[PDB]
Each structure stands twice: as structure tokens, then as C-alpha cells.
Amino acid sequence: MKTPITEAIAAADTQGRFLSNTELQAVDGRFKRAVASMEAARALTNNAQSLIDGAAQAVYQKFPYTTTMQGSQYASTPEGKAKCARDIGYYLRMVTYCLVAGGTGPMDEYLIAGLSEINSTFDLSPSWYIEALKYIKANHGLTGQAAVEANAYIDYAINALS
Amino acid sequence: MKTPITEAIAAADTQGRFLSNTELQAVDGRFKRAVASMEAARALTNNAQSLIDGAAQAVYQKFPYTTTMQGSQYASTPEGKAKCARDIGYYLRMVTYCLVAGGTGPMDEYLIAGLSEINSTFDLSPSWYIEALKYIKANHGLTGQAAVEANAYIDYAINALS
Amino acid sequence: MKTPITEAIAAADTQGRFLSNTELQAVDGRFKRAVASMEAARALTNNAQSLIDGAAQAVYQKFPYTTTMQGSQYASTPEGKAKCARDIGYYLRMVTYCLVAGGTGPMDEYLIAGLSEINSTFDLSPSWYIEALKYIKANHGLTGQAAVEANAYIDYAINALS
Amino acid sequence: MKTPITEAIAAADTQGRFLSNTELQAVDGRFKRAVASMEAARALTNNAQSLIDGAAQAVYQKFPYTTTMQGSQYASTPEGKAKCARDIGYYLRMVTYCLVAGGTGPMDEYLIAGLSEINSTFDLSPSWYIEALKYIKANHGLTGQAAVEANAYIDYAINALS
Amino acid sequence: MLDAFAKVVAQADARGEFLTNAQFDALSNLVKEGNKRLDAVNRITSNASTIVANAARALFAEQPQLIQPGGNAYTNRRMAACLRDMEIILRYVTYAILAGDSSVLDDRCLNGLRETYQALGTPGSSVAVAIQKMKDAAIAIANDPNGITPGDCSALMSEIAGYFDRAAAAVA
Amino acid sequence: MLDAFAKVVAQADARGEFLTNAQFDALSNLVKEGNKRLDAVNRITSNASTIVANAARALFAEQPQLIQPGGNAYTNRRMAACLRDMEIILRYVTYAILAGDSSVLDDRCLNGLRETYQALGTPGSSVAVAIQKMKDAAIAIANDPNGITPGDCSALMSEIAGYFDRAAAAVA
Amino acid sequence: MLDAFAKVVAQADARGEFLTNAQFDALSNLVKEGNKRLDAVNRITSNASTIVANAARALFAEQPQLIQPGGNAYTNRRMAACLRDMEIILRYVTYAILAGDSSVLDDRCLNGLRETYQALGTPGSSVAVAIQKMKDAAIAIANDPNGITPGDCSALMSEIAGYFDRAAAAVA
Amino acid sequence: MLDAFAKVVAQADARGEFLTNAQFDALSNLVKEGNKRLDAVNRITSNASTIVANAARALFAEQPQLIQPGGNAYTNRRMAACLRDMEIILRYVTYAILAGDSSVLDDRCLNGLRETYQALGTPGSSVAVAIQKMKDAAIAIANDPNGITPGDCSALMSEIAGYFDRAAAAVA
Amino acid sequence: TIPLLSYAPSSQNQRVAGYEVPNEETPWRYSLEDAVDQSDIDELIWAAYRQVFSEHVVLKSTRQPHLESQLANRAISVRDFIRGLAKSETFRRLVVETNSNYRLVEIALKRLLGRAPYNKQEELAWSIRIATDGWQKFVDTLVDSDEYTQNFGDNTVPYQRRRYKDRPFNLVTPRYSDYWRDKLE
């Protein structure tokens, strides 16, 4: 996975050499930022229950048609509302995982990989997820450099959906 | 492009052989079908304006929110309505091109290639064009084998967008 | 084999695409030509014993040294006559197989492949078989486009040998 | 290994052709020059013990400062003296194989290959063996062609080490 | 790389007998009923995307373990792979239908597929049930009697079902 | 590459207007004489070997410098190469005839062929003469009025000559 | 190839549940002990060549059968190979130390290592002895504390010994 | 690939002992009879085409099922392949004869060839018979005392026969 | 550092010679040498993507935009495009990380070079190439082998050399073997 530690290790493995001081400096920077990163991850996960529901309602408000006009792609049925909750929960869980991993690795492996391929087959408009992630970026409740890390990952997902 | 004529020629070219009776029989079948193909293309282009207008209204009825929701991606503004007409006209024009070419070549080289990237970047939901092409498939006003051919190419576009 | 249907299948398989109307039109052309192809095949097979013997005598007359000059690569012995008859019969039998298959597949798999190696190692000058095939091409006993098809496959064999 | 016979075989095999007269001439030359080389090999094996003893004393005298420093990479201790004798013997033992093989094949297979990494890790200076083998090179007791061919192999090894 | 024609020609070449009248009249029947075959394959290929998508929705509804976290059809990359595999099976079956022979299907798709699935751990039984769902959907849409010149082609539909069944049994 | 149908479609797409009635009529005229195009290609391809052989013997008789020692078409290896390239030109021209357009001929065979011969040191003028020999031989064989349903195929024969001329002018 | 953070995240992804408070405190402890890990890898990498070479000197004498004629370390080339493989194991172990888990050691190495040597004809038991001798060398060089603020780094030494033992047991 | 001299030096290196007198005189005997070895390989390779052709005629005379339609070397393709494989075995055994050892023959020709023929359907027994036919041919052509300075070379022909036999036993 | 330990080659279809005209099972030859129009160049690029990565894993994120533009402007040879696919990070994550060196030799040989391993000894023989030189250098030498230059020149997409009555490598070899499935449930 695209974790800072593993990225340094792979860079050294490409050249078949023992870990040079450059890689060690990189991982040291990761450890120094990890305090803020882990506090941000804790904050997001302990507020996750409110965030997921709020994002669901936000997308329902921004796209009223997604709540009314019939179709499996829409949340016209309670089953569809469950699907919506499940998927926005997936996104929130992945962002917390990326926050703790220190890189985009987790969301790239479990979400972004082939995201475009399937969101067209099942006819899930990416704009829905875009708006939901924007809500989460506005109500995350983090501050300072913790906030900057979390918002960076959220926006990575936003740009990937687009 | 993947025109029957060119397809057989390329198949013989990669095998470094003069065109044998197999390829000649294939292109003969193409010429036998060409009479109906040309008939179908004539029919589609002679009533092109009616088909374009009807398809526009069809998507406006199936998706009411696209006619009111503010934003550039929607046709709430008259400019957007003009753009929508232009696009569905493009689709119909390519259908006629494919009918004349006897293959999917034109469609792949002028529409399908990179279709996902454009419909994702400008936030143009594929379902819109899906519904438009369904209307065209229902109102084409063809009969017999000619209708079969046109329907097949329209559905190729539909499945390519999906 | 290189049969038209299978050739279209393989062409679509290399690109991983379902059989679009291009392939379907090719197979339709094969079926439309099948009427004449089957006529020609029946004509060649029902008269497959007079022509084989006639071609043997034709080669003996054009090249009198091939049945009198001493050696093992000649038809002077009765066993040599049997082998010569078997060879001309093989060419005619392969042409009929290609006529029924619709394509040159049978010819390539059972005859054309490795033709030069055998004609060079066993001292079988191609000219002998060229003349034999010319005799068959002149006395096949067909008319119209069926005659065209017979005289196309036999000429392919001629231009492959030499 | 890189024997003249073997090299000709390999050159013919990579082309896929039967042995032409060029290769046969080369192997003939090998046999013609294999009279003197085999004589030299016989001579050097029959007096092998005396010549290795002389070479051992030669290196002890040329490098007494290594002969006195205590350590694993030195012959100062009696166990190290035994090791030094065996390795000097190894060089002579390989030179006889080289003489019989008529090529540099044994040199590359039993030594030379990875000489740098060994002389870097154990740091056993090649100069030790080089001085011993120069003693051998003058005292070998060959004459004429035997002497010059043996000298050629010996100096190939010496210049290869450096 | 065989079709019906190549199959019969290969038998005839193995025996070494000139094509018999019986073989000729046995293949003329195939050509005479070729337009029906072409229509069937055209209908299945025209609805390919919808067929695979609907069957996939049904499969994940009947076996939720696949789409639950930790299942083999989770993480959205493996979901894409699963959809791709379903459409691949449909594609090779379509090849088999148009050819009229199972040679292509057994030469490329069903030549040891079990081993790959077995090694990766992908549940083969679930794949089989998915193929069967695709079978019923496709056969129904192709045999839809309204919208085409009528005729009796139950035999061809049974052959299509046989191809789907062959794949489902060979992978499971 | 663009065949005739593809060429008209591509031009219409570049301008951005549905194919007009005049273009439709032109394409209908082309398909009305399509059988003639197919017959011509069949006749030329079945005599390929004889065409190239006769033209080669004539070329070496008219320009002996090629087969003289020290010339370009000598040493029996370059003779093989010369025959191979002559038949290559014939093959791509036959492709062009069947297509109805010179795009394939101009994209693979004569595309950057002048530079190739100029670097190799072969006389391009002689190559042009060889192509002309092939032109007369092939046009005679293809326009042979005995053996098939009578009619006027002169327009197509002129088109075939045009392809050969295009190659001959592009190599020299 | 995973790291500590990625390992816990992967287990959490299999479970499909947000990172628990317990996991958070575990990773916080891992970050708390980061500086010592970095120091250890820096120190071992600065002396890597000397470490392996010194251990090798002793290994060949304590196992003379390998360097006697007919043994697996005999000849210059195979001696070079043995040194090379010792250094390879050391390199992948250093990778593992920085990672914090033995995942890298088992992924691109130690996956069938015993079988490879067994097919090559190398005695696996002797390889195990070599790995253990290397293990002693490495634990010693990392556990010679001087020149830096002291701490109880015994945990790091124990986990390094665990990595070396894992390799030794995997090859024998 | 080890020839005779390389084989003895390799065995001596494994033992770690200077080349023994016995091995010296063995290789000296080989060199004294070297002209005979060279002449044998020269005769076999100079008649390679005729050897393979005559052996092929004999094979198809003794086993007519091969050239009967629907057999195992029927069709020009499989005929060419059978001729090719006969010549290939001859080529690698000639290599072995010049070398003086069978290492090349068992490493680059007979190294799994039995499995290849098991899968292909080619009879291993029949190819062994063919190898024996070529053995008789090569032994007879080399044993033509007319045209060469005479002497007793049957001893050297016995090992050529041995190499042919080794191939025949290894192929099935 | 060491002359790669010699391996004994086994008889294979690719090693054998055969005077066959192309079959319907012919691999199909995607050659950029003709400098075909952009639409056909798309097919060629897709075939290389289909070979280095499997059809299964070639998604949008896998697609390198730079590579798409590379092989469009008659740039570095198709061989170098293949090498770029091979050394790309997504390939290392998908293949290199999920297999051991011994299996990696087999996978890369089947896909990049297009021939199966000659024998287990060859799998061992090039495993060290991966280790000492580095995976990037291993694929470098893999596509810089004399065999490769003969097999696919420069502008020819790699293909299975000749799977005559043989299962295609893609359909017999998974992305990773069941051995790594121990990390899966």
C-alpha cells in the first residue's frame, strides 16, 4: 500500500540498497506528524455517527430527485436509504483509515481503484458522493494542522470522484 | 476504424497474405446489406429534426430536475437547452454515420473513445443520453431489417455509455 | 481453422468486445454465398474419380520424363502411379473441404502449411501439381458463380504451390 | 565451460545449423595444439608438491609482515600456514585443469568469476598469490611451445586479477 | 478455433473420406436456419450490459456476504473484477452461440478456469449461480416473441441454455 | 485507414452536417458496381505470382544493369529481396483496389518508401519501371473479357491503373 | 508488503469497523518508540558490511565441510554466492526493522526459501547455522549501547532476534 | 555443457585432486584418435540432408499409418514437423559426437522431450525406431573406407551408436 | 555481481521451429512500426495494457495518462512502453508485492517476455537478478535480453510466443498464486 514507510522501503528496494539516510529522514517526518494525524483520526471516528447521517440528509436535500423518482439507483425505497448510509459510511471509514496510515494508500486500494468503472455500471452519480464529502469536510469538527490533514484526504477523494 | 472492409484488410495485412476468398465473401455480404443500410440512413436524416426535438422533450419529461436545478451542467438556462439539442443531434448524426459505414467504426472514433472522461468532467450524467437514445430507438420510424440495423447501432451506443 | 465464422470470433476476441453488427454481417454474407458454395462442392465431389485419373494422365503427357526417367521420385512403377493418384486426389479433396467449410482453413491446415519443405525433400517439382490443377480447373464441370468459386480455390492452391 | 570445442558447439547451436567445416577446422586446431598442452600438464602434475612448497616459501618471504600479524586473514599461526598451503595448491590445481581444457573456461568457472567481491570481503590480497605464481612461472620446467602456452594462461590470470 | 462447419470437416478429414451426401445435407440445414441464430445473438449482444448488471444486483441480494466488508466482492476494485468476470462469461458464451460449436468456449474460457478461481479463493459456487441467473435472463430476452418475425426456435434456445450450463458446471 | 464509405463519412463529420442526398446517391452508385470491384480484385489476386514473375523477367531484360555483377539486383539475395518488394507493392495495391481508396496504399506501402530506397542505394527509377510493368500485366489480366458476364468495367480498370501510377510516382 | 500502521488498518478493513480506541493507543505507543527504531536501523546500516564479513570469517572455519573440496561453498563462485545470500538476508531484515513487522521478510523472501536451497543441493541445516551466527552478530552490534542517550531498547533487540529466528526456522 | 576434457577436469575439481595419471592417458588416447573423430562427424554432417531424407522414406515405408490420411505425420504441416524433428535429433547428436560426451544431447535435446511427445500424441516408440534408422545410416556412411586413409575405427563408431541409443531410450 | 547461475533449457513450442502459416489461434501482432492513425494506436496501447497488466486489473487508476500520450507521438518504442508499465507503481503493488521472487520470474516471463519458464532451475536462476539488481533492473534486463530483441523487435507488443494446443498464460496464471491467499479469507 502507498504508506510513507512502505514507499521509502520500496524506493530503497528498487536500488537494492540498505535504507539510506534520506528514507530515514522521511519516516522521521512521518512520525513527527503522526501525533496530529492520530488525534485527527480519533476526532473523526468518535464523531462518525453524526457525520454519516448528516451527509446522507445533505445529499437528500441537494438532490431531491434522488429521494423521489423511482429507480434502484435512487434511494426511493428504505432499502435504497440503507444503501446510501452504507456507502457514505464506507467513505468516512476510508478517510479515517487514510488519516491513520499517513498516506492515500488505504483509500486508493479499497475505494479509488476502479471507482469510475463501477459508479457508471450501477448508475451512481459521482456528484452525490461529491456533495456528501463536502458536507463532511465542513462539519468534521477538527482544527489546526489536524484539520488540514483530514481535509486534504477528503479533497483527494473529491477530486478522484470528479 | 472498425469498418468491415478495413477489418478484413487488416486481418490479411497482419498475416502478410493476399486477400483470399474468405475476405472477398465478407465484403460481398457487406455490399449486399449496403442497400438496406443506405435506405436506413436516408430515413434517419430526412426526419432528423423531429427526432432531435422529440428526444430533447423526452429527457425533459423523464428528468424534471434538469430543467430547473441551477448550474452549468443542467439545461435550466436557454443556452443549456441549446447545448442539449446540439449534443443529441451529435448522437443522431453519428448513428447515421454508422449506418452508412456498415460498422461501429465512426461511433468508436468520434464518440465512444474517452466518452467516460468527458461525461465525468463536465458532470453530464450518462442516464440523460441513455433516455434520449431510447426515445430515438422507439421513434426511428423504420421497418424490417433496416430497423434492425439502426436499432442495433443505437443500442451499441446505449451499452457503451452504460 | 480459419473458417469465416471463427475468424470473426477471434477478431472480436482479441479486443474483448461482444460480436457487433460487423461480425454478424460477415457471417450473413457467408450464409448468403453458401447456396453457390454447396452447389460447387456437390459438383466437384460427384465427379471426383474421372477427374483424378484424367489429371494423372495429363501430367504424364505434359512431362513424359516423369514416368520413364529412372528413380524413386517418378511414377514409372505401379506404386509410384498409386502415390501420384493419391497426391492429385489430395489436392482435389482439400479443395472440396475448403468449399464446404466456406474458407481456406482446411487448405492451410492440411495442405499449404509446410508445402515447400516436402516438395523439396522428396524431389516433387511443383510444376507437376500445377499442371494437374490446371486440368481440374478446365474440366471441373460447373457453371456461373459456383464455377467461379471452384476456380478460385484451385487457383489459390496453384499460386501457393508456386 | 569455455572450452574451444564447447565454444564452437555453442556458436553452431545458436544459429541452429549443422557443424560446418569452419567449426571442424577450429576443433582440429584444438587437437593439434593439445599435444604440447597435455605434456605441460603432465609435467606440472608430476612435480606439483615440490613447486607448491617452493611457492609457499616465496610468498612467506615476500610478505613477512602479513606472516607476523595475527588474525584470521593471515598465516602467522600454524593453522593459517596450513590454509595458505592449501590455497596455493588450489591455484596450481586449477592451472593444470586450464592446461588440459585448452581454454580459459576453468579459470572463469573455478575462479575469476566474483574475484572482486571475495578480494573485498575477506580482503586476501591477490598480490600474495601473484608473487607465488610468478615463482612458478619461471621454475615450471617447461620448454618451447609448452612453456609459452602455459605462460599465456598464467599471465591471463594475473592481468585478470588486476 | 472451430465452428460447426470446421467440426464436421475435421471429423471427415480424420476419417479421410470425401464429404458424404449425408454430411452435406446435415450442414445445409444449419445454413437454412442461420438467420434465426443471427437474430438470437444480436438480441443477446444488444442487451449485454443490462443482462450482466441486473444479474449482478440479484447475486448480491441473494448472497450479501460478498458485498459485506471482508467479502470477495468488496473494496470496489473486486466489485469491478466481479462484473468483468460475469460479462466475460457472457462474451465467451455468445461466441459459442454464434459459432454453433462449443470449441471456442472450451478452448479459451473453460480450459481449466477452476484452477484459477480455486487458487484465488473466489467462491466458484456463487459464480455458478450467477451464471445461471444470466442464463435465464438472456434466454428470456432473446426468446421474447413480440418484436420479430415469428417462428419456432425452442431448439436454439435450449442450445443457448446448454452453453451457459456447460460453463457453469465447468467452473463449479 | 479510411475506405470509401469511411472517407465520405469522415469528411461529413469534419464539416458537421448530416450526409447530404448527393453523397448518398454517390455511395449508392458505388455499391451498384461493387460486384465489378470484387471480381477485379479476385482476378488480380489469383494471378499474383504470374504477374510478378512476368514483370520481373521483363524488367531484367530491359534494364540488364540490375542483374549485371555489381548492380543492385544481383547476388541472388538481393534478387530475392527485389521480388519480395515487388510483390509487396502488388499486395498493398490489391488492398487499395478492394477498399476503393488509396489511403491504405499511402499509409503502409508507398508511405516513406522513397526515403527507404534512397538510403538503401537502389535506383528508384527502376522500381517505377517495374511497377509500370506490373500495371500493364495486372490491368490486362483483370480486364480480360473472356470468362465472365460481359459489361463495361473500364472505370474500375482506370482506377486500378491510377493506384499503380500513384505508387510508381511515389517511389521514383 | 505492509507496515505496522497498514497491518492494523488491514485487519480493521477485514472487520469493516472504524478503528477502535484500543488500536489508536497501540499505534500511539508505536510512534512513542519511533526514535529508537530509527537509531537502530541507522547504526546497523552504517556497519552492515563489516557485520556480515566478520560473521562469515568465523562461519566458514566452524563448518569446514562447506569449504572443503566437494562442499557447497567450495570454488570462488559459490563462495561469492554464499556471501551474497548472507548480505541479502541482512538487507531484508533491515527492511523489516524499519517496517516494524516481519511482513516484508515473508513476502519477497522466506516464501519457499527452504525449497529453493533444497533443490539447489545446499544443505539447509548449514544455512540455518549461518543465519543463527548472523543473528548473534546483528543482536550484538545493535545491543552495544554507547554514544547516545541510553534507554531500555531491549524490546527492539528481542524483535530483531525474532526476525532472524523466523528466517532461520523458515530455511530449516 | 561439458565435453570430455571438461568432464574430467570437473570431476577432478570435485575431488580436489590434481589430474591423475589414469585420466591423463585416457584423454591422450582420445587425442591420438582425434582425426578419426573429426572425419566421422565430417562425413555425417556432409550428408545430413540425404541421411534424413533416406531415413524418412524408410520410416514411411515401414509404418504406412503415418502417411495414411488422418495419421500422425499426415498433412504437409505435420510432415514438415516430423522431418524437422528427425533432423534436430541428428543435429544434437552430431554436436555430442564432436564433443565426445552426451552432456549436450541430454541437456538441450532430451531434457523433457519425452513429456513433449507424450502430450503431442507423437509415438515415442516410433521416434525411437527412427533414431535407430538414422544410427544405421550414419554408421554406414562414416564406415566407408573408400575415399579415406584406412584404419580400424569401429571402436569410435560404437560410441556414436551409443549416443543414438541414448536418444532412442530417452525419447520414449 | 555473479554470472547468473546457468539453467538447463527444456523443449518448448517457443523454442521449437515450425513452418506454419498463421492459424486462427495466431496471437495477433500489434506493430506500431507502420505508425498507424491514432484510432489504431489506441488498440495497440490497449493490447500492451492487456498484456503487462491483465485484462482484469486495467482500470482508470491503473491507466497512466502519460503512457497514453507516449505511444501516440511516435515516442519511445513499444518495448519501452512495456517497461514503463512494468516498473510503474501500480504493477509493483499488484504483482511484485503479492508474489515471491521465484514466482515473479515466472509471471514476468509469461507476460513481459511472453514465454513460460524453461524449468524450475531458470526460476531460481533469475530470482537473484530481481534481488541484487532490483526489480526495475530485472525487468530492464528481461526486456533487454537478446531473445526479446529477436522476439518482438522494438515496436511490437509482446504476445504469447506460440500456445499451440496450450492454455494461454493469462488464463492459466492468476495475478498472484494461492500461496499469498494465506493473507486472505
Ligand SMILES: CCC1=C(C)/C(=C/C2=NC(=C\c3[nH]c(/C=C4\NC(=O)[C@H](C)[C@H]4CC)c(C)c3CCC(=O)O)/C(CCC(=O)O)=C2C)NC1=O
Ligand atoms: C468499500 C468500497 C465500496 C463502495 C464505495 C461500494 C459502493 C457500491 N454502491 C452500490 C450501490 C448503491 N449505492 C447507493 C447509494 C446512494 N443512494 C443514494 O440515494 C445516495 C445519493 C447514495 C449515498 C450517498 C444505492 C441506492 C445503490 C444501489 C444501486 C442500484 O441497485 O441500482 C454498489 C452496487 C451493489 C449495491 O447495490 O450495493 C456498490 C458496489 N461498494 C464497495 O465495496
Ligand SMILES: CCC1=C(C)/C(=C/C2=NC(=C\c3[nH]c(/C=C4\NC(=O)[C@H](C)[C@H]4CC)c(C)c3CCC(=O)O)/C(CCC(=O)O)=C2C)NC1=O
Ligand atoms: C460530437 C461528440 C461530442 C459529444 C457527445 C460532446 C459532449 C459535450 N457536451 C458538453 C456540454 C453539455 N452538454 C449538455 C447536455 C445536456 N444538458 C441537459 O440538461 C441534458 C440532460 C443533456 C442533453 C441530453 C449541456 C447543458 C452542456 C453544457 C454543460 C457545461 O458547460 O457545463 C461538452 C462541453 C462543451 C460544451 O459546453 O459544449 C461536451 C464536450 N462533445 C462532443 O464533441
Ligand SMILES: CCC1=C(C)/C(=C/C2=NC(=C\c3[nH]c(/C=C4\NC(=O)[C@H](C)[C@H]4CC)c(C)c3CCC(=O)O)/C(CCC(=O)O)=C2C)NC1=O
Ligand atoms: C494432403 C497433403 C499431402 C501431400 C500433398 C503429400 C504429398 C507427398 N507426396 C509424396 C511422394 C510422392 N508423390 C509422387 C507423385 C507424382 N509422381 C509423378 O510422376 C507425378 C508427376 C506426381 C503426381 C502429380 C511420387 C512419385 C512420390 C514418391 C517420391 C519418392 O519416394 O521419391 C510424399 C512422400 C512420402 C510418401 O510416400 O512417402 C508426400 C509427403 N502428402 C500429404 O500428406
Ligand SMILES: CCC1=C(C)/C(=C/C2=NC(=C\c3[nH]c(/C=C4\NC(=O)[C@H](C)[C@H]4CC)c(C)c3CCC(=O)O)/C(CCC(=O)O)=C2C)NC1=O
Ligand atoms: C478471459 C478468461 C478469464 C477469466 C475467466 C479470468 C478470471 C480471473 N478473475 C480474476 C480476478 C477476480 N475475479 C473475481 C470474480 C468474482 N468475485 C466475486 O465475488 C464473484 C463470485 C465473481 C464474479 C461472478 C474477483 C473479485 C477478482 C479479483 C480478485 C482480487 O484481486 O482479489 C483473476 C485474477 C488475475 C487478474 O485480476 O487478472 C482472473 C485470472 N481471467 C481471465 O482472463
Ligand SMILES: CCC1=C(C)/C(=C/C2=NC(=C\c3[nH]c(/C=C4\NC(=O)[C@H](C)[C@H]4CC)c(C)c3CCC(=O)O)/C(CCC(=O)O)=C2C)NC1=O
Ligand atoms: C446481420 C445478420 C442478420 C439479421 C439480424 C437478419 C434479420 C432477419 N431475420 C429474419 C427472419 C426471421 N427471424 C426469426 C427469428 C425468431 N423467431 C422467433 O420465434 C424468435 C423470437 C426469434 C429467434 C430468437 C424467424 C423465424 C425469421 C423468419 C424466417 C427466417 O428467415 O429465418 C429475416 C427475413 C425475413 C424478414 O425480413 O423479417 C431477416 C432479414 N438477417 C440477417 O442476415
Ligand SMILES: CCC1=C(C)/C(=C/C2=NC(=C\c3[nH]c(/C=C4\NC(=O)[C@H](C)[C@H]4CC)c(C)c3CCC(=O)O)/C(CCC(=O)O)=C2C)NC1=O
Ligand atoms: C465472393 C464474392 C462474389 C463474387 C466474386 C461474385 C461474382 C459475380 N459477378 C457477377 C456479375 C458480373 N461480373 C461482371 C464482370 C466483368 N465484366 C467485364 O466485362 C469484365 C471483363 C469483368 C470485370 C472486370 C459483370 C459486368 C457482371 C454483371 C453485373 C454485376 O453484377 O456487376 C455475378 C452475377 C451474375 C452471375 O455471374 O451470375 C456474380 C455472382 N459474386 C460474389 O458474391
Ligand SMILES: CCC1=C(C)/C(=C/C2=NC(=C\c3[nH]c(/C=C4\NC(=O)[C@H](C)[C@H]4CC)c(C)c3CCC(=O)O)/C(CCC(=O)O)=C2C)NC1=O
Ligand atoms: C528472495 C531472496 C533470495 C534468495 C534467498 C536467493 C538465494 C539463492 N542462492 C543461490 C545460489 C547459491 N546460494 C549459495 C549459498 C550458500 N552457500 C553455502 O555454502 C551455504 C551453505 C549457503 C550460505 C549459508 C550458494 C553456494 C549458491 C550457488 C550454488 C551453485 O551455483 O551451485 C540461488 C541459485 C540460483 C542463482 O545462483 O541465481 C538462489 C535462488 N536468491 C534470492 O533472490
Ligand SMILES: CCC1=C(C)/C(=C/C2=NC(=C\c3[nH]c(/C=C4\NC(=O)[C@H](C)[C@H]4CC)c(C)c3CCC(=O)O)/C(CCC(=O)O)=C2C)NC1=O
Ligand atoms: C579451488 C579454487 C579456490 C580458491 C582459490 C579459494 C580461495 C579461498 N581462500 C580462502 C581463505 C584463506 N586464504 C588464506 C591465505 C593466505 N594467508 C596468508 O598469510 C598468505 C599470504 C596466503 C597464501 C598465499 C587464509 C589464511 C585463509 C583463511 C581465512 C579465513 O577462513 O577466514 C577461502 C575462505 C574459506 C577457506 O578458508 O577456504 C577461500 C574460499 N577457494 C577455492 O575453492
Ligand SMILES: CCC1=C(C)/C(=C/C2=NC(=C\c3[nH]c(/C=C4\NC(=O)[C@H](C)[C@H]4CC)c(C)c3CCC(=O)O)/C(CCC(=O)O)=C2C)NC1=O
Ligand atoms: C535520519 C534518521 C534519524 C536518526 C538516526 C535519529 C536519531 C535520534 N536519536 C535520538 C535520541 C535517542 N535515541 C535513543 C535510542 C537508544 N536507546 C538505547 O538504549 C539504544 C542504544 C538506542 C536504540 C538504538 C534514545 C533513548 C534517545 C533519547 C530520547 C529520545 O529521543 O526518545 C534523537 C533525539 C535527540 C538526539 O538528537 O539525540 C534523534 C534525532 N533521528 C532520526 O530522524
Ligand SMILES: CCC1=C(C)/C(=C/C2=NC(=C\c3[nH]c(/C=C4\NC(=O)[C@H](C)[C@H]4CC)c(C)c3CCC(=O)O)/C(CCC(=O)O)=C2C)NC1=O
Ligand atoms: C531443439 C529440440 C526440440 C524438439 C525435438 C522439439 C519438438 C517439437 N516438435 C513440434 C512439432 C511437431 N512434432 C511432430 C513430431 C513427429 N510426428 C511424427 O509422426 C513423428 C514420429 C515425429 C517426428 C520425429 C509433429 C507432428 C509436430 C506438429 C504439431 C502440429 O502442427 O500440430 C513441437 C510443437 C511446437 C512447434 O512446432 O514449435 C515441438 C515443441 N522442440 C524442440 O525445441
Ligand SMILES: CCC1=C(C)/C(=C/C2=NC(=C\c3[nH]c(/C=C4\NC(=O)[C@H](C)[C@H]4CC)c(C)c3CCC(=O)O)/C(CCC(=O)O)=C2C)NC1=O
Ligand atoms: C576439418 C576437420 C577434420 C577432418 C574431417 C579430419 C579428418 C582426417 N582423417 C584422417 C585420417 C583418417 N581417417 C580415418 C577414418 C576412417 N577409417 C575408417 O575405416 C572409416 C571408413 C573412417 C572413419 C570416418 C582413418 C583410419 C585415418 C588414418 C589415421 C588418422 O589420422 O586418424 C586425417 C589424416 C590424414 C588425412 O589428411 O586424411 C585427417 C586430417 N581431420 C580434421 O581435422
Ligand SMILES: CCC1=C(C)/C(=C/C2=NC(=C\c3[nH]c(/C=C4\NC(=O)[C@H](C)[C@H]4CC)c(C)c3CCC(=O)O)/C(CCC(=O)O)=C2C)NC1=O
Ligand atoms: C510531456 C507531457 C506532454 C504534453 C504536454 C503533451 C501534449 C500533447 N497533446 C496532444 C494532443 C492534443 N492536444 C490538444 C489540445 C488542445 N486543444 C485545444 O482546443 C486546447 C486549446 C488545447 C488544450 C489546452 C488536442 C485537441 C490534441 C489531440 C490532437 C490529435 O491527436 O489529434 C499530443 C498528441 C499526441 C497525444 O495526444 O498524445 C501531445 C504530444 N504530450 C505530452 O506527452
